[PDB]
Amino acid sequence: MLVANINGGFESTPAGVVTDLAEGVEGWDLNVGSSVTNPPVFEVLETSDAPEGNKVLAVTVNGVGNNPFNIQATALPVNVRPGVTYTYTIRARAEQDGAVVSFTVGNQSFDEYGRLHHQQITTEWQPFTFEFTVSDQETVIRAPIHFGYAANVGNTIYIDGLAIVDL
Ligand SMILES: O[C@@H]1[C@@H](O)[C@H](O[C@@H]2CO[C@@H](O[C@@H]3CO[C@@H](O[C@@H]4CO[C@@H](O[C@@H]5CO[C@@H](O)[C@H](O)[C@H]5O)[C@H](O)[C@H]4O)[C@H](O)[C@H]3O)[C@H](O)[C@H]2O)OC[C@H]1O
Ligand SMILES: [Ca+2]
Ligand SMILES: [Ca+2]
Structure with a gap:
């Protein structure tokens, strides 16, 4: 497979709680x-x-x-x-029921190329997918996933298998 991102499925990282937030997950x-x-x-x-x-x-x-x-x-x-x-x-x-997540992609100036907005996360694994175009001259970008929604208090959200692919 070919993807733009690195360690999209966390397979590189030792199991356990992450305390080193910036660099503990490759x-x-x-x-x-x-x-x-x-x-x-x-x-x-x-x-x-x-x-x-x-x-x-x-x-x-x-x-x-x-x-x-x-x-x-x-x-x-x-x-x-x-x-x-x-x-x-x-x-x-x-x-638990009720979780909300936004899946975004943007440049180092925090301008978004696109997102999935307030996605309703359920207790069952689902795929979430969208397309975006790199509309400026950037070669290294970032993919922020946002979890800090009040509705998520008291919940655990699980993610896996991030794949950003040349359409
Ligand atoms: O420590 C530092 C961190 O602070 C830094 O974090 C980044 C900060 O910038 C973040 O990007 C902003 C995210 O919020 C976006 O605004 C959203 C865009 O979406 C709007 O919602 C729309 C509603 O309509 C829908 O149709 C549409 O799909 C939605 O987009 C929403 O109302 C706005 O609030 C801003 O534009 C971004 O700038 C970025 O995610 C963080 O990662 O990272 C660096 C670190 O050193
Ligand atoms: Ca995985
Ligand atoms: Ca890092």
């Missing part, structure tokens, strides 16, 4: 803003339920901040070419 930047006074738990889980490989990322939300991105997992680097159109695909589910 291919990813995890970020919790200081406005999040009850911080989440990020965990790489080894599980037979994994859509891809043996591992998933789990995000347990115990509170939120001011903006959905104050709890986020961002794929970086994402290696792309100007003008090219890409397909984004990921799988997600949640421990």
Whole structure:
């Protein structure tokens, strides 16, 4: 397979709670803003339920901040070419009903090329997919997933199998 992103299925990362948010997960930047006074738990889980490989990322939300991105997992680097159109695909589910996630892609100036907005995550694995075009001259971009929605408090959201593919 060919993908723009790195370690899209967390298969590179040792199982366990992630405390090193910026660099503990190859291919990813995890970020919790200081406005999040009850911080989440990020965990790489080894599980037979994994859509891809043996591992998933789990995000347990115990509170939120001011903006959905104050709890986020961002794929970086994402290696792309100007003008090219890409397909984004990921799988997600949640421990409980009611979860909300936005799946986005943007440049280092935080301008979004596209997103899936307030996706309704269920207790069953589902694919979430969209297309975007790199409409500027960037070659290295990023893919922020936003979890800091108030509706997610008391839930755990699981993601796996991020694949950004040359359409
Ligand atoms: O520590 C640092 C981090 O702070 C930094 O995080 C990045 C900050 O920038 C973030 O990007 C912003 C995300 O919010 C976007 O605005 C959204 C766009 O979507 C609008 O919703 C639309 C509603 O209609 C739908 O049809 C449509 O699909 C939706 O888009 C929504 O109302 C807006 O609020 C801003 O445009 C972005 O700039 C980025 O995600 C973070 O990763 O990262 C660096 C780190 O050092
Ligand atoms: Ca996986
Ligand atoms: Ca990183």
